[PDB]
Structure formats: structure tokens, C-alpha cells
Design a protein around this nucleic acid. Structure first.
Lengths: 178, 117, 54, 136, 84
RNA sequence: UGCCUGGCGGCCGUAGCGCGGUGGUCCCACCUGACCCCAUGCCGAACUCAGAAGUGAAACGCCGUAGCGCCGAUGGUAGUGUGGGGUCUCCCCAUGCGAGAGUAGGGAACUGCCAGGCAU
RNA sequence: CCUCCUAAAGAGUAACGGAGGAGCACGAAGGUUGGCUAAUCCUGGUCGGACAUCAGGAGGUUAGUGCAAUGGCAUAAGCCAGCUUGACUGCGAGCGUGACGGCGCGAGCAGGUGCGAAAGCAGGUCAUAGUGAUCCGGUGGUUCUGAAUGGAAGGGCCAUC
RNA sequence: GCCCGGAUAGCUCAGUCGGUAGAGCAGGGGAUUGAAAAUCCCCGUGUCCUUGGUUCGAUUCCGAGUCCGGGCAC
RNA sequence: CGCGGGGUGGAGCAGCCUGGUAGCUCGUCGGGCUCAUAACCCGAAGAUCGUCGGUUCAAAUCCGGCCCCCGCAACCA
């Protein structure tokens, strides 16, 4: 709800006024949020990636893709073509609704702030909050005494520098141990 | 952005075939506020006859200049102008577009208005 | 003779006496071929059947 | 004995040493020794010469070697009937053509440098002549 | 004595098959035209020399004389024939 | 007639790249919405459809700039045909052919077609 | 039997000359429509922080290619999805190629078909390795014949072992 | 490429005329001795190979094909 | 010369056939029984597969070079 409505009126004027952009539309915008568990654990057992997707879906708000391996050699020699990761990808209303369940709920329910002290960005203006465990789930009876697994929160922006890019995000207010 | 890069790659697969077979091309182009068509001579010489949504003879009466009903208007005009110059035996060039909505409506409307492929 | 992949006969499913000959990997999948092909005797395309068996 | 550390191939055609070579002019050091006659240089000779200058010039200067021996040259075993396949690789050869500069130095006096190349050149297998850098 | 230096990995020799006959300035209908196999790059095909078999023999597709061109982006060489 | 924008070319790096400037109620991008036919191995990013305001931002066209890519003489040089010589592992002589590299210099494109706007 | 060099800028031509492989795979790894684009490194990244999955950037194929090397390819000959059986039967001008046997190549025509809106495409795999003359004998088809007439072993043709 | 004949406790065999899952030895625990070698004990495992079929129900009874072992073929 | 086999915990042997897997008996070290040692019992440790490279996602294994050990061969007048 409120995030895209807030970005529209406030974050576009704020960034325009602080950075004096050449034309208003050149304010940085929010480009897709991709989430992603990655493997978690356990290639071999080959059940758990299908359980990982069914956990991830609830807080994604869409089915996970189930990414499979490229040529691979890391913590095991995965070869190529095995199932491995998870992957989501959001934009528009789905992302703006998501970005409100982040920030409002999920971040204040992380106890020690592994989710954000100081954290730094890519080479241009994209960022990646690797959350440690389990956040919140839809209506009721959230906990089923599961098997942990955090996830990458890779949020993306159209922005030209990481110094500029953190004026964005911060205009929606960003963490209390930051 | 990068879909002018992508479109031209899709096009060239078919388009090289038609000029290499030596056949007259009904080439289409799409843009979200304009729909464009030309019949081009087989060897890239004269464009034999064309219709767009920026000529007045099409433009004045149509609700939008970039929708399927506006595509039907361009197909309807263009075929009969090609027959008046005596052109038939033309082959379709989908120019890196899908054969889908405005383009499909146009290509059917072009044959139905008269054009014999 | 050749490989471990082996020769089968694909028999026309029209009652006419005609076949194509072809090799098929029995070990990896022995799930017998259907497949449609020309039969010159009925002079039309017909399903072929089987794999050198009764 | 220098040799390439790894090559694409292990044995090689005899070839001709026909032409005249690219490094006609001294250009790192001030002056140097050029091959005048053509010939082959056996890696051991390039070594024997590097040592000779090092015994002569001592702890002054810098010595640069431009030629590098890299054509493998084969020898049949002792006492073997002809033509049971191509010989084993024995020693590495640089093919020197006329005008190829072999060695350069700088950081040393001219009179010492003329003497240093006399010692080295006596160990080489071609006639050789002292060469000076020059402006163009 | 008669001392021995032994066999080898040798060579197994070649073959012979590599290309054996381009043709020029002819008049036949479907002459082989350029049997430069193993390519479609060394030569490419256009006009009535749209041949280009499933070995890249660039046979003439109607009667003529072979022009040879170098054409377009990437500068490929093309066989096309002038009709006789 | 000219200037500018778009499609199809020709030639296919002197045509490219970089760097800077610059253009938007013709047009083109981006653009919003996804209802609906359509569509995503999840994702309206892509594809597709329906369209107002917005912006020239990114893309792209245009211009300037030689930093780079790129073209490049003449002369000499290598090589070779034929014929001849010799100190013959190779080089000379006669005369025909004559590079590659490198130097001067050129260099930021020329141009046909139909299509729209603006000025004349 | 294939590929590179020797091989002399058309033919590619020897030597117990230099260097590598093949004796198959494939019912999709074939057809066709449609879409898409690589190795590698960096930077950010919940434990593989040497290397999974992710996002961003540089690069511009340095990759891919069922398997060897050479040629090849972005309109992809690469990678993915949908429908599918043209891995068709009859021929076949014209031809490269070889002493011959033989091997390669193929517009187009006739039948019937698949894919695609259509043009068009398709007669195996991006090409060159993946082989076996003839006799003999086997299985199935075919009025073609079948030693007095009629039938039948048998023989022929065709498919194939 | 035929006719045969087998395909189970880990093994060989077999209670298995279709109404119904075992002997011999293999691994763990208990019970005794200069631990042991060696007594005695209680568990050891199968949709009888994959598919057809008779039938009131049947693996085996009647059948088609994969793999092993034995003959004659070529 | 040449051909083929071998190079494993401190010892002797196994695994080596397009491959991911370290096993046995001795010896060793710690604990135990015994007056004490022997033996006997229990527990543990020990090989980055001769060495260098290559192919491979992965190599002790397959491939190539070198050193080292063994078997056979190195004649015919």
C-alpha cells in the first residue's frame, strides 16, 4: 500500500530537491526485488529444495522458480544441471506490497540486527540484505517448528552511484542499528 | 532501449530469406502511437506503395493511431493502393514483431482488403 | 557386428507387407516405437508398429 | 643452457636459415655485439658467452641477451641404422642471420666494453662486430 | 652389430578427402561450383548460385558465369552467378 | 526548393570507438495501466494489448573534438620468374614482377528510395 | 578409415617423417515455428567469501560444438520452449571425384505429409571417422517363372539378415 | 538368432497340487570359560522378476518378454 | 639397445579395467592384567598414493616426460 504512494509524493520531491536533478523523472526508482534462498543446504537429499520453495512462497507472494546449476564446482562438485537454488523476482504492486512487509514488520522482528549495521552496496546502486532466519507468515499459526534457512534480499534501483543510491531507500527510512 | 537491439536480430532471419528468394516485401512497423506499412520492391529499390498512421487519409477518423482497429485501417488502405499499382505476389515481413495483435489484424485485413500473396 | 545398440524392424500397421529397418537402444529405454511414416504400397502415411517381435 | 619452458611441439623440421634478421640495431643498451656471419647458436654458447662477460665486466653494468635458443635440434643415437623414426631432441638452437645483435650492455665504459666482447665472441661460432646505438 | 632404435606412435597418415575441385565461368546447370566443403564461410552463396549442399558444396542453381563478391558486414566472400 | 524525425537500402571501419555538447504538442524513445485477447518453466523485465499527463534522464539521431580504432603514398628494403656467375649450408649480375612493416598525409562518412512535420 | 603439418599460395604428393582420433551415439541430440545469447574477473551478497544460487558492472565469444583435429557459425550450425515424424516412397537434369569396383553432390518432377498466418522449410544430425566386395544361406513380400497338364519344393525380382 | 532350465533370508536350496513365507550357514544382544576356540538361547527376510490369465480366491496353476547357466546352429 | 610389469600408514600387500570410494596383517603409541617383561585384551594414531605435467567438473586410478626397482630381449654369417 503506502510505500508506492509515499514514494510518489515524497521521495520523488525529496531527491529532486536534494540532488537538483536535471528533470524530475531522473529521480532514482525502484527496480525489481529478487529475494532468493540459494541452495540453503543439502543437494543430495533432493527433497529440501521443494520444501524450501514452499516456505519461500508464503512471504514471496508468488511461486519460487527453482533455479538449477550452471557449471559447478563449489562446496561439492555439483557438475551442471542439478536443482540447486530458489529465486523470486518482484516489481510494481507486488514489490511495493512486499517492501512494506519488509521495513514495517520483518525488520523490527529481527532481534540482534544481523539485518543492517552500515551495510554497503554494489558498484552502482543495487543492494543486498542477507536476512538470517524467519520473519512473519500470512494470517495466523506462523511457526511449525521448521528447519531455519535465511535468504538474500537483493533490492535493485535505477541509480547512477551507490552514494546517491543510499539517499534513496533512506528516504523510506532504513535500519535502527544502521 | 535494448529492444531495438533485440528486434533487429529477430527480423533479419526471415528478411534475408525474402530478399534472397527475390520476393516483394510487405514490411510492417509498429510503435505505440503509430502503425506503419510499406510494400518494398524485392531488391530494395523503390518502395512501391505505403500506408502509415501519420498520413491524413488514414489519420483523421481513427480513435487511436496505435491500436488494432488502427492497424486494420492501415491494412485496408494499403492493399488496394498496391493493387492499383498492380502489385500482388507480395510476401509478409513481420520485422521482429510477433504475428499477434495489431500485426495480425493488419495482415489479415491486408489480404482480405484484396492482397493476393 | 556393430555397437551394443541393435537392429529392429518397424512394421507397417496396414495389412500390407512392408517395413522400415532402424536401430534402437534397447537397454536405455525399451519402450517400443509408434511413429507415423510413409507406406508406398497403400501410398499414404500410416502408423508403424513394433520392433522385430511377435 | 637456456631453453623454452614448454612448447607446442617437441621435434621440428630442419628448415633454412636463409634471410637477414630483424634486430639489426642496438636499442636497450648503448652498444653491443652483432653477428656478421650467419649460423646457429647452441644455447651452451650463449651461456659460455654470458659467463665470459660476467667474468670481464663484473659487478658493474647490465647485460641484455637478445637472441634466445628455441628450435630443438635432434641427434640420432650413437651407432644406429638409419631411419627408424626421427631422432631424440638434444640441444636447443637460436638461428642467427646476418646483422642480428646478440648482446647489449650499458652502465660500463666503452674501452671495457670492447674488451668484454672480445672474450665472449671468441667463444661464439660466427664472425662478430661491435655495434653502437646511434641517434636515428 | 645391428642395433635397434625401435618403433613409434608414428603417424597413421591422413586420408585424401579434403577438397578436390572448384569450377569457374561455366554454363552447366548444377555444376559443383565450389566443392569447398567443411565451411560455408570460406565461400558463401547468393543469387542463382544459391546452392549450398549439406556439406557446403556451393553448386550453381541455374546456368551462368560465377562472379564472386565480397559482401556486407563481416566481409564474407560470396559466390553468385550471372545468368547465361 | 531547404532544414528535422522515422522505415527499407546501397557501399559495408576514411563509415568504428572515446570524450564533450545537444534535441522532444511532428516524430522516437522512455512512459503510465493491464482491463482484455495475449504472456512469464516465478517475474506485464521480456512478449502483448489499451492509452492520458509526464521527461529528454537513459536509448538514439545530430554537431564538435583526434585520444584511440581505421585508411595510407613515394622511395628504399625483402621475395621471385627467366637467363648467367661465384668466394655455392648461400649470395651476386641482367632484366621482368615487387611486398609486409614503417614515414608524410588522410581521418569523426558519402549516397539512392518512399514516408511525416516545420520553414521557404 | 578421419583431421592437421611436411605438400612446393589449383589438383595435395613419399618416407618405420612430425602430432591426434575413430570401429559409434541419437526416437531427440532429427524436422519446424517461436524466443534468447558466451568464457572469465571484479564489486555487493544469509555458512561453500578458493569455486554453488543471486544482483550489478566490465568484457565481447576468449565460449559452445555428442565424441579427434581442421574448417565453421550470431541470419547462429549454440541454448531453451511448442507442435511433430520429410531419419519420407518413386525418380533425377547437372556434376565434382576415383584405374576400375565404388564413393560424394543435387535444382527440379510425381505421390503423400509435418511445421508455420504466409513466404517458406524439411529426402537425418554443421561438415569431413562410425567400415565390409562377392559367393553361400535365412526371414517376409511379389503370378515373374515353376522341366508332360494343374499345383508345389525350387529359382528370379523387391525388402532385409 | 531356437529348444531347454533357473532368477527369493546376504547365499544355496526350499515348506509353496492355489487357499499356508522355511531348513543349513551369515551379523547383533544375553547366558560361560586362561577373553577365544567354543555350547545353549531369542530376531533375522522376500508384493517369490516385469506383465498377462484361469478363479470362489492362485506368486507357483496357464502364458509373453529381460538377465544367468546347457545343448544344437554358423 | 628394445618390450612388458612395479614405486601405498614405520614393513609386506589390496584397491588401478571414464575415475569421485584408503582396506588387511605386522609394527607404533595410550590404557589393562603380571612382582616385572613376554604374550593376552581394549582404544587410537598413521598414506595430501615416486615425481612433474596434461585431459577432466572430479584423477592414486586415465594420458604424457623424467628418475628408481624387476622380468624378458639385445642374434644371423
Amino acid at each position: 500500500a503506502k510505500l508506492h504512494d509515499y514514494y510518489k509524493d515524497e521521495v520523488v520531491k525529496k531527491l529532486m530537491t536534494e540532488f537538483n536533478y536535471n528533470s524530475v523523472m531522473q529521480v532514482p526508482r525502484v527496480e525489481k526485488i529478487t529475494l532468493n534462498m540459494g541452495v540453503g543446504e543439502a543437494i543430495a537429499d533432493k527433497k529440501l529444495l521443494d520444501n524450501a520453495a514452499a516456505d519461500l512462497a508464503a512471504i514471496s507472494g508468488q511461486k519460487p522458480l527453482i533455479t538449477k546449476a550452471r557449471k559447478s564446482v563449489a562446496g561439492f562438485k555439483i557438475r551442471q544441471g542439478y536443482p540447486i537454488g530458489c529465486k523470486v523476482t518482484l516489481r510494481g504492486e507486488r514489490m511495493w506490497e512486499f517492501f512494506e512487509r519488509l521495513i514495517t514488520i520483518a525488520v523490527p522482528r529481527i532481534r540482534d540486527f544481523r539485518g543492517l549495521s552500515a551495510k554497503s552496496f554494489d558498484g552502482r546502486g543495487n543492494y543486498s540484505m542477507g536476512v538470517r532466519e524467519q520473519i512473519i507468515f500470512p494470517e495466523i499459526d506462523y511457526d511449525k517448528v521448521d528447519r531455519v534457512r535465511g535468504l538474500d534480499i537483493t533490492i535493485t534501483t535505477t541509480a547512477k552511484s551507490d552514494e546517491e543510491g543510499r539517499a534513496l531507500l533512506a528516504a523510506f527510512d532504513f535500519p535502527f542499528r544502521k | 532501449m535494448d529492444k531495438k537491439s533485440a528486434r533487429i536480430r529477430r527480423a533479419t532471419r526471415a528478411r534475408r530469406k525474402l530478399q534472397e528468394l527475390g520476393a516483394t516485401r510487405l514490411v510492417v512497423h509498429r510503435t505505440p502511437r503509430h502503425i506503419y506499412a510499406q510494400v518494398i520492391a524485392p531488391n530494395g529499390s523503390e518502395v512501391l506503395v505505403a500506408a502509415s498512421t501519420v498520413e491524413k487519409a488514414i489519420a483523421e477518423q481513427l480513435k487511436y493511431t496505435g491500436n488494432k482497429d488502427a492497424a486494420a485501417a492501415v491494412g485496408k488502405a494499403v492493399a488496394e493502393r498496391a493493387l492499383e499499382k498492380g502489385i500482388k505476389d507480395v510476401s509478409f515481413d513481420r520485422s521482429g514483431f510477433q504475428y499477434h495483435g495489431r500485426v495480425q489484424a493488419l495482415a489479415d485485413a491486408a489480404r482480405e482488403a484484396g492482397l493476393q500473396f | 557386428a556393430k555397437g551394443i545398440r541393435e537392429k529392429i524392424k518397424l512394421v507397417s500397421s496396414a495389412g500390407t507387407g512392408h517395413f522400415y529397418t532402424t536401430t534402437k537402444n534397447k537397454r536405455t529405454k525399451p519402450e517400443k516405437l509408434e511413429l507415423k511414416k510413409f507406406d508406398p504400397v497403400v501410398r499414404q502415411h500410416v502408423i508403424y508398429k513394433e520392433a522385430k517381435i511377435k | 643452457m637456456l631453453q623454452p619452458k614448454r612448447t607446442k611441439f617437441r621435434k621440428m623440421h630442419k628448415g633454412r636459415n636463409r634471410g637477414l634478421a630483424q634486430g639489426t640495431d642496438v636499442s636497450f643498451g648503448s652498444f653491443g655485439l652483432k653477428a656478421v656471419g650467419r649460423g646457429r647458436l647452441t644455447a651452451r654458447q650463449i651461456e659460455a658467452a654470458r659467463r665470459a662477460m660476467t667474468r670481464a665486466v663484473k659487478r658493474q653494468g647490465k647485460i641484455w641477451i637478445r637472441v634466445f635458443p628455441d628450435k630443438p635440434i635432434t641427434e640420432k643415437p650413437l651407432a644406429v641404422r638409419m631411419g627408424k623414426g626421427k631422432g631424440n631432441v638434444e640441444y636447443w638452437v637460436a638461428l642467427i642471420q646476418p646483422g642480428k645483435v646478440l648482446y647489449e650492455m650499458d652502465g660500463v665504459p666503452e674501452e671495457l666494453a670492447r674488451e668484454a666482447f672480445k672474450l665472449a665472441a671468441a667463444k661464439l661460432p660466427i664472425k662478430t662486430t661491435f655495434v653502437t646505438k646511434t641517434v636515428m | 652389430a645391428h642395433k635397434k632404435a625401435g618403433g613409434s606412435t608414428r603417424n597413421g597418415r591422413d586420408s585424401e578427402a579434403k577438397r578436390l575441385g572448384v569450377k569457374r565461368f561455366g554454363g552447366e546447370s548444377v555444376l559443383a561450383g565450389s566443392i569447398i566443403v567443411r565451411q560455408r564461410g570460406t565461400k558463401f552463396h547468393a543469387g542463382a548460385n544459391v546452392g549450398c549442399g549439406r556439406d557446403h558444396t556451393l553448386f550453381a542453381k541455374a546456368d551462368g558465369k560465377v562472379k564472386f563478391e565480397v559482401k556486407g558486414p563481416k566481409n564474407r566472400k560470396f559466390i553468385s552467378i550471372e545468368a547465361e
